[PDB]
Amino acid sequence: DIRVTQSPSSLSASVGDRVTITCRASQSISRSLNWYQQRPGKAPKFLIYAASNLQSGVPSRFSGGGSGTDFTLTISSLQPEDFATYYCQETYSRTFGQGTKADIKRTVAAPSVFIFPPSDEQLKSGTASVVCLLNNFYPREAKVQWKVDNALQSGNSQESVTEQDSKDSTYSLSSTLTLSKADYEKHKVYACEVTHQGLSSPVTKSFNR
Amino acid sequence: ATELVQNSSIGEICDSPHQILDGENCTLIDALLGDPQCDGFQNKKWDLFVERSKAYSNCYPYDVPDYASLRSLVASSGTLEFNNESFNWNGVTQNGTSSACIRRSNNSFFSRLNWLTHLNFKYPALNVTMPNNEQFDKLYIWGVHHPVTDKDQIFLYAQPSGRITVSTKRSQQAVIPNIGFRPRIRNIPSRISIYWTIVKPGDILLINSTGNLIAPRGYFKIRSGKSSIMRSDAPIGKCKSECITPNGSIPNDKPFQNVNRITYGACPRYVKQS
Amino acid sequence: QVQLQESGPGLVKPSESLSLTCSVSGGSVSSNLHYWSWIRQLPGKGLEWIGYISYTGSTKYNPSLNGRVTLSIDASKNQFSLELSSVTAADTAVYYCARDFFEKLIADDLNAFDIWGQGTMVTVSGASTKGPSVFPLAPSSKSGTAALGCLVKDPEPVTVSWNSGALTSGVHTFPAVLQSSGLYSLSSVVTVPSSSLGTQTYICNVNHKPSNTKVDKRVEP
Ligand SMILES: *[C@@H]1O[C@H](CO)[C@@H](O[C@@H]2O[C@H](CO)[C@@H](O[C@@H]3O[C@H](CO)[C@@H](O)[C@H](O)[C@@H]3O)[C@H](O)[C@H]2NC(C)=O)[C@H](O)[C@H]1NC(C)=O
Ligand SMILES: *[C@@H]1O[C@H](CO)[C@@H](O[C@@H]2O[C@H](CO)[C@@H](O[C@@H]3O[C@H](CO)[C@@H](O)[C@H](O)[C@@H]3O)[C@H](O)[C@H]2NC(C)=O)[C@H](O)[C@H]1NC(C)=O
């Protein structure tokens, strides 16, 4: 029985800011804990050992300290490539913390958009998938509106969002509209209305046929 | 269990009548081995030595099997008197230094240890005899280094594998070094295993080893007394009290106490409640 | 270095014993002072340590899982396996195999998790397996930047690389969404100069492992 508490759950800070993550324990664990970093799509990385000993892949801006119950992980000058999820593990417990993933305070947006009709090989299978793209926009909050012959569509579109590649700290979003082959050929105007802050007016990309 | 229970402390430890030695950033073993920040403690005495929780090691990382045995031995003696002996390490290189054990802005090492490396890419089987022609018990502190890659085992000692043997009349000690890269403490993945060997009056210290060895520079005097050690963060004040707890000095008027179980001197007995 | 690659099924029907195998390369699996462990990942719970074993075999397990975990080592193959009996929907996760050293020199701490493996997703939906369908995404090609990608429809979205890995900078593959048909679907895109389209060949590489399906489709204007 050992308890671990990591605060906060998430935060936001600019490039060059000094951010601190706190890992609190219920029982005294002496000068004894370690901090790790997992980037999106990667395995965690061994950053600090015994609360304050930096390891192989450290860029020297990382640092840790504390004794007893209250430990701190500090990034002196936050860099874009530091975007990841950070954990604190307590040893005799072998328990991972809840995790703290923060992201860079984002500059002002610049969404670049594209759209894509269904392929000729997919339309033969009786299924049409129209894909819209939103590339390198930032902040996250964006609205994708589908218009079939300039008619509002809902419930038949799906979309994903990537996380900051940490080179430019920008997201990307792509909606896929799914309809049958019959419903595809009943119509010809297919649009993708994008609502976003970095756009002074909703940008619409459309094709025909 | 109310009027007859001492339930409070003055918040600090009296430096009288007991000789109090404060640890500051040093542990007892950091001062024992010769940690550069702990050089001020050399050859000091004490009746009670207080380690601080803020203490840390700032030399070359080290491990000690039976760490509560060696700490309680040195504590029960109450002295750090160290006499340099002339070990004749012929065929080796002495006074090995490290980049993470800095003193006076230079690469150094433990002041009570002689880290031995090869010489001319030679390193013969070292057999050193050292008698104890005294009347008092000697304490020898030696070590075994653990190189990370045998790339370093060859560079440091010019043998694929070392072995350390420390023998006396009663005792024999055999240690084999462990090649292995390890988590970097102060940018060092290598370690050193610290052991100890006692020789009695009339006994001889025997070192039957090639040298992945951290040779000692002498011996510590072993006394037998009421000296001890305590972990506390309370300040040291100018006062007199025949009872010391990690929460501070308390009066021994009451027959009982609930301040702390850990006590030193003529103290009342501890109660579980009130 | 010491590489670790987990191998095993990406789909496990419930009530079955989950089984995965970690392969250690470049070093001896037998170690005088070392433990081999397994750890699972879920979004919302973070990481959760599972098991951990010495060369001799010494085990302790996470008391959260009531003994359902059983690991094992075979030095003849430099491998150590995971066996989780009676899996439920709460056991779908990402499983990692990790090389760990324990030191306990004075601190009595020193459970260090040094190297970490790539990882293998496992699922407990227990339905069936069917391969994907790769569809290209043509460019606009107005000509001053264009974009093109591959659309993947219909357990794991595996690897999507571009031209065997020659084209990497500027690629955003998106996480799969779950359609109402129970089958997943994602898309991987890349932005290229709007002047190299007719002479530059673009081929995305998808290689479905839980169905033995590797497809190389040309995205052509
Ligand atoms: C025990 O060790 C700690 C940690 O090394 C000591 O605390 C720090 O000691 C350094 C020694 O120089 C102090 O650095 C000096 O102060 C300024 C900040 O005002 C610093 O930027 C400079 O580099 C300068 O060298 C540092 O201030 C000090 N920090 C604290 C919080 O005290 C400590 O003095 C040692 N001794 C004891 C009894 O704690
Ligand atoms: C390893 O390092 C230790 C510590 O520096 C060396 O001990 C020191 O050796 C020097 C040289 O002999 C001593 O200085 C000399 O002492 C003689 C004594 O007769 C004196 O006549 C000279 O004028 C000079 O001061 C020094 O005292 C001694 N350190 C102590 C604390 O006594 C040791 O020699 C080194 N060994 C090797 C192999 O490098």
Residue numbers in the entry:
A (entry chain C): 1 to 209
B (entry chain A): 39 to 312
C (entry chain B): 1 to 143, 147 to 157, 160 to 226
Authors' text:
We describe a focused, protective antibody response, abundant in memory and serum repertoires, to a conserved region at the influenza virus hemagglutinin (HA) head interface. These include the receptor-binding site (RBS) on the “head” of an HA subunit (1–5), sites on the HA “stem”, and a recently identified site at the interface between two heads of an HA trimer.
A distinct subset (five antibodies from five different subjects) has a light chain variable region encoded by the IGκV1-39 gene. The five antibodies with light chains encoded by the IGκV1-39 gene segment, each from a different donor, all engage HA similarly. The HCDR3s, while unique in sequence and length, all curl toward the light chain and create a blunt antigen-combining site that brings light chain framework regions 2 and 3 into contact with HA. This arrangement accommodates the HA-220 loop in a groove at the heavy-light chain interface, with HCDR3 tucked beneath it. Also, in all five structures, a Ser53Asn substitution allows the Asn side chain to accept a hydrogen bond from the main-chain NH of HA residue 224 while donating a branched hydrogen bond to the carbonyls of residues 49 and 50 in the β-turn at the tip of the LCDR2 loop. The side chain of Tyr49, anchored by a hydrogen bond with an acidic residue at the sixth position in HCDR3 in all five antibodies, is in van der Waals contact with conserved HA Pro221. The HCDR3 acidic residue (supplied by IGHD3-3*01 or by n-nucleotides) then forms a double salt bridge with conserved HA-Arg229. The antibodies belonging to the IGκV1-39 subclass had the greatest breadth of binding. Lineage analysis suggests that both antibodies from D1 have arisen from a single naive progenitor.
